[PDB]
Design an enzyme around this catalytic site. Structure first.
Site, PDB file in Angstrom:
ATOM      1  N   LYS A  77       0.849  -1.234   0.000  1.00 55.41           N
ATOM      2  CA  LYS A  77       0.000   0.000   0.000  1.00 55.41           C
ATOM      3  C   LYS A  77       0.870   1.266   0.000  1.00 55.41           C
ATOM      4  O   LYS A  77       0.381   2.294  -0.384  1.00 55.41           O
ATOM      5  CB  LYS A  77      -0.911   0.034   1.237  1.00 55.41           C
ATOM      6  CG  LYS A  77      -2.001  -1.031   1.280  1.00 55.41           C
ATOM      7  CD  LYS A  77      -3.150  -0.672   2.244  1.00 55.41           C
ATOM      8  CE  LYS A  77      -2.710  -0.610   3.700  1.00 55.41           C
ATOM      9  NZ  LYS A  77      -3.889  -0.537   4.627  1.00 55.41           N
ATOM     10  N   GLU A 127       8.261   2.383  -5.976  1.00 59.83           N
ATOM     11  CA  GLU A 127       8.289   1.977  -4.558  1.00 59.83           C
ATOM     12  C   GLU A 127       8.430   3.233  -3.692  1.00 59.83           C
ATOM     13  O   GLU A 127       8.956   4.201  -4.155  1.00 59.83           O
ATOM     14  CB  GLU A 127       9.445   0.974  -4.375  1.00 59.83           C
ATOM     15  CG  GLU A 127       9.688   0.484  -2.938  1.00 59.83           C
ATOM     16  CD  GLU A 127       8.537  -0.284  -2.293  1.00 59.83           C
ATOM     17  OE1 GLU A 127       8.766  -1.366  -1.724  1.00 59.83           O
ATOM     18  OE2 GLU A 127       7.417   0.221  -2.326  1.00 59.83           O
ATOM     19  N   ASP A 128       7.945   3.174  -2.457  1.00 62.10           N
ATOM     20  CA  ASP A 128       7.971   4.331  -1.534  1.00 62.10           C
ATOM     21  C   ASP A 128       9.391   4.599  -1.032  1.00 62.10           C
ATOM     22  O   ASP A 128       9.823   5.721  -1.066  1.00 62.10           O
ATOM     23  CB  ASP A 128       7.016   4.105  -0.346  1.00 62.10           C
ATOM     24  CG  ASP A 128       7.194   2.812   0.439  1.00 62.10           C
ATOM     25  OD1 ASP A 128       7.894   1.912  -0.022  1.00 62.10           O
ATOM     26  OD2 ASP A 128       6.621   2.715   1.512  1.00 62.10           O
ATOM     27  N   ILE A 129      10.065   3.584  -0.532  1.00 64.57           N
ATOM     28  CA  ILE A 129      11.388   3.811   0.115  1.00 64.57           C
ATOM     29  C   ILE A 129      12.299   2.601  -0.029  1.00 64.57           C
ATOM     30  O   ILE A 129      11.773   1.512  -0.082  1.00 64.57           O
ATOM     31  CB  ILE A 129      11.218   4.172   1.613  1.00 64.57           C
ATOM     32  CG1 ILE A 129      12.536   4.623   2.265  1.00 64.57           C
ATOM     33  CG2 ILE A 129      10.562   3.025   2.402  1.00 64.57           C
ATOM     34  CD1 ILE A 129      12.342   5.390   3.592  1.00 64.57           C
ATOM     35  N   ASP A 131      15.310   1.205   2.232  1.00 64.15           N
ATOM     36  CA  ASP A 131      15.921   1.408   3.569  1.00 64.15           C
ATOM     37  C   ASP A 131      16.924   0.257   3.713  1.00 64.15           C
ATOM     38  O   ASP A 131      18.032   0.420   3.292  1.00 64.15           O
ATOM     39  CB  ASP A 131      14.796   1.515   4.614  1.00 64.15           C
ATOM     40  CG  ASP A 131      15.229   1.835   6.032  1.00 64.15           C
ATOM     41  OD1 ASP A 131      16.407   1.684   6.310  1.00 64.15           O
ATOM     42  OD2 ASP A 131      14.367   2.228   6.844  1.00 64.15           O
ATOM     43  N   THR A 135      13.061  -5.591   0.932  1.00 67.79           N
ATOM     44  CA  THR A 135      11.726  -5.614   0.275  1.00 67.79           C
ATOM     45  C   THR A 135      11.938  -5.599  -1.250  1.00 67.79           C
ATOM     46  O   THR A 135      11.349  -6.403  -1.948  1.00 67.79           O
ATOM     47  CB  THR A 135      10.816  -4.477   0.784  1.00 67.79           C
ATOM     48  OG1 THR A 135      10.584  -4.617   2.189  1.00 67.79           O
ATOM     49  CG2 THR A 135       9.476  -4.442   0.068  1.00 67.79           C
ATOM     50  N   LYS A 160      16.945   5.938   1.979  1.00 65.36           N
ATOM     51  CA  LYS A 160      17.576   6.096   3.312  1.00 65.36           C
ATOM     52  C   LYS A 160      18.872   5.295   3.197  1.00 65.36           C
ATOM     53  O   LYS A 160      18.866   4.140   3.581  1.00 65.36           O
ATOM     54  CB  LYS A 160      16.654   5.607   4.431  1.00 65.36           C
ATOM     55  CG  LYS A 160      17.156   5.878   5.849  1.00 65.36           C
ATOM     56  CD  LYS A 160      16.322   5.181   6.938  1.00 65.36           C
ATOM     57  CE  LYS A 160      14.829   5.467   6.831  1.00 65.36           C
ATOM     58  NZ  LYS A 160      14.074   4.844   7.964  1.00 65.36           N
TER      59      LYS A 160
HETATM   60  O1  LIG Z   1       6.773   4.476   7.595  1.00 64.51           O
HETATM   61  C1  LIG Z   1       7.875   4.073   7.252  1.00 64.51           C
HETATM   62  N1  LIG Z   1       8.990   4.800   7.545  1.00 64.51           N
HETATM   63  C2  LIG Z   1      10.269   4.394   7.227  1.00 64.51           C
HETATM   64  O2  LIG Z   1      11.183   5.115   7.518  1.00 64.51           O
HETATM   65  C3  LIG Z   1      10.381   3.173   6.554  1.00 64.51           C
HETATM   66  N2  LIG Z   1      11.517   2.518   6.104  1.00 64.51           N
HETATM   67  C4  LIG Z   1      11.064   1.419   5.552  1.00 64.51           C
HETATM   68  N3  LIG Z   1       9.723   1.315   5.604  1.00 64.51           N
HETATM   69  C5  LIG Z   1       9.273   2.439   6.252  1.00 64.51           C
HETATM   70  N4  LIG Z   1       8.047   2.875   6.594  1.00 64.51           N
END
Ligand SMILES: O=c1[nH]c(=O)c2nc[nH]c2[nH]1
Ligand SMILES: O=c1[nH]c(=O)c2nc[nH]c2[nH]1
Lengths: 214, 217
Positions: A77, A127-129, A131, A135, A160
């Protein structure tokens, strides 16, 4: 122009709205939108010259077009708000594209793509992030094995770099975020805070504020 | 301001961009966005004062809050752009809410392609966000299923678009952003085989364009 202040309680206020869960402001909506639109131009410039399997006219290779569009897979999501904004900027830059969704949870796949003809196609994952990188490594291996695309690239809203646990370098990156838990613009704590127009860092420990499963 | 005209080929031009697949313009981005925000204000005003089951404090009933938010179920794929914009307006008006997704398709008879992952909706206020109500059959199926399987306190529907002339079964969403003509619409989530969804404006489709992309994606 955004007005950023702190109230008497020491709480961050952006345009009159208080964010008591926030430690710091990472990016205002204006900065976020400018960064997404800039990456949209990069994506359009990179793909518009390319060609891939012609499924509209029965072979062989043909330019990316409305007949044979770039295939975008959006990860639900977390990426839906980013995706909604990015596609409209891609449209502004005239990049032919179509979007399907896969859903992952923390790994388990909860929803598969409905697209069934990605073989020999240029595929871009939104994709959102990135880190840890875990994923994306899971999604990339799954998409490569099941769809056998001509090329597979990744565009992330946020990188990140300080959180990496595995090798993952997205092809396109809109923003670099601090090595902290981020909230806002799709980023959440148990589905809360996704609707914020700005990205903030979360005050430590607030990640447990909503323990109840929805 | 938007400029809407036709070029020398009779093709609709909005802000310098040609739309050769379009028959008529239904709504510009400015009208759409103003209409969504107005409904967001109505939704916030309606739900802000209500209470429902308390799953945060394992208590009985509590006001809608970040601890016990409004539950929103968005219908993929058509509603994702509308949902992204609406949730941001709902946040502007301070309505506490969370969003999950379901996906349905027709074979016409209906089938669920993707289920919601929320599992504690009993006694909760639930709002469905859908792109369009035309025949009403898609929403009749979804509302009957969510009601039977989740037992929500209340169940309401917000649609971006109402096509009133298309009704085959009784369906009046509680919230409607725009009323569209009784024609095939494209843009702002509306599509022909996934094309045209990224347009910032809504148009009617030229009758000869609906089969332009016959190849399955
Ligand atoms: O809400 C979120 N904040 C994050 O910093 C993050 N990193 C991976 N997935 C995440 N979800
Ligand atoms: O793109 C679309 N245009 C429509 O008019 C419509 N009605 C139902 N579903 C629809 N999708």
């Amino acid at each position: 122009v955004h007005v950023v202040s702190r109230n008497a309680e020491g709480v961050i206020v952006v345009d009159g709205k208080a964010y008591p869960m926030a430690e710091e402001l990472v990016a205002t909506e204006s900065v976020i939108q400018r960064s997404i639109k800039a990456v949209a131009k990069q994506i359009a410039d990179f793909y518009r010259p390319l060609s891939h399997r012609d499924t509209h006219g029965g072979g062989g290779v043909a330019p990316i077009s409305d007949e044979n569009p770039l295939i975008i897979i959006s990860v639900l999501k977390g990426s839906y708000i980013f995706t909604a904004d990015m596609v409209r900027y891609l449209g502004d830059y005239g990049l032919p594209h179509v979007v399907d969704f896969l859903r992952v949870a923390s790994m388990q796949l909860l929803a598969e793509t409905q697209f069934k003809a990605l073989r020999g196609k240029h595929v871009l994952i939104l994709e959102d992030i990135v880190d840890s990188g875990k994923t994306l490594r899971y999604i990339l291996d799954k998409v490569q094995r099941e769809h056998q695309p001509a090329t597979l690239k990744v565009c992330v809203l946020a990188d990140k770099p300080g959180g990496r646990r595995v090798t993952m370098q997205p092809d396109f990156v809109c923003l670099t975020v601090p090595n902290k838990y981020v909230i806002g613009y799709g980023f959440e704590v148990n589905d809360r805070f996704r609707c914020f127009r700005h990205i903030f860092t979360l005050r430590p420990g607030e990640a447990r504020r909503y323990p109840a499963h929805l």
